């Protein structure tokens with residue numbers, strides 16, 4: 001049992017360029033086995049880190065800044081987490097990596113395609129690898145992005161090992177809004193972990209009470225960590241000044257969804273979603289945050305000087321939350337003296353509505369969340385009962401707008417992520433699950449519900465709840481090529497709830 005709120009929240013340093021000109025910014029990031037202490041009372045933990053850090057360095061760019069990152073593997077040839085050899089079938093290395101800039105409006109060969117992996121020093125490369133140095137032209141709205149490993153059949157492990165980091169796009173136009181900035185703009189990467197007494201990470205090599213059918217190790221369909229970390233520390237505290245802060249909240253956990261509140265009942269102000277500023281600020285007492293979602297929020301500590309306020313969590317993982325463990329994320333202490341006047345603002349009017357768009361609907365895809373069961377008895381989670389390797393069926397035309405209607409007859413929520421694009425949420429609508437399973441027929445049991453205000457901006461990872469049809473609309477561009485869409489519960493993604501998405505150009 002690890003005592004809460006005894007370590008200061010780390011704030012990862014901003015990565016510095018290896019070279020930089022007006023025309024181009026060039027970075028190098030090397031994946032390394034490293035060691036860091038995750039809590040005061042734990043021995044140091046073995047981890048895989050971008051530049052030896054967990055989380056990796058925060059990367060800061062401007063809109064349209066012409067960025068290059070050479071992501072390099074300098075990792076050991078064997079993994080320290082349990083590899084399931086049965087889920088994926090010219091011998092390949094055991095350890096493979098590839099970096100996805102999540103939310104990036106990125107050319108396809110710089111997107112971190114799962115089969116564009118590489119081993120150490122690029123010695124072996126996957127069949128879709130094209131380049132060492134990834135290109136991020138950043139021709140997109142200011143927003144909270146994040147970067148993480150995306151390698152075929154290894155994503156859950158490589159991310160759990162520590163390969164996650166923040167990437168912020170600043171649009172200079174935003175600066176007139178005078179949102180809290182500099183030291184008052186802080187990323188919060190939330191990752192749940194289970195840690196052994198000797199400090200080493202625990203990741204299960206099989207489900208609990210394994211049928212002796214199962215290979216060993218075997219993938220599991222879900223992972224819930226006993227402990228919550230923010231920016232690489234267990235249940236940390238952050239000293240803040242009694243003023244407005246902006247927080248870039250990122251769910252970088254494998255499976256766990258959070259439902260966040262402040263334990264004094266105080267409110268957040270949501271200013272942004274995955275795809276950038278909301279049209280209007282939204283005052284919220286709590287919010288849901290599934291894997292890979294980002295909330296850009298203001299918290300105003302002005303009236304709370306001296307207080308300790310816990311960022312709390314009501315969502316369970318595999319059970320009800322426990323008040324003494326996973327009900328806690330971190331603790332704010334409003335005890336830092338003001339370094340200057342708070343000149344920041346919490347404005348109402350942030351940006352254009354998505355509905356200012358009037359694109360023609362080129363196509364409507366109906367998609368279902370399902371799966372089968374393998375030789376060993378395990379669930380294999382599938383998008384439209386296709387395997388990753390089946391020929392591509394999601395094939396939007398570049399420059400066109402589609403509506404995707406995602407049908408979820410399963411028992412749980414799935415956070416669905418589309419690469420390249422951000423999209424708008426149209427509505428959700430409940431249906432008869434038994435009927436749909438029995439007949440394939442979709443019968444609605446209620447009217448369509450528009451998105452809550454949090455989802456009236458631009459999203460790239462979206463919760464598809466059980467027993468609902470979710471509809472989204474996306475314009476596919478500006479690049480054509482081979483991308484992916486998938487569930488972002490990593491245990492599902494790897495087996496095998498991920499499909500190719502080809503954006504075609506005549």
Ligand SMILES: [Cu+2]
Pocket residue numbers: 100102148292417488
């Ligand atoms: Cu992602």
Ligand SMILES: [Cu+2]
Pocket residue numbers: 381413414415487488489492493497
């Ligand atoms: Cu899923």
Ligand SMILES: [Cu+2]
Pocket residue numbers: 100150417419484486
């Ligand atoms: Cu992805």
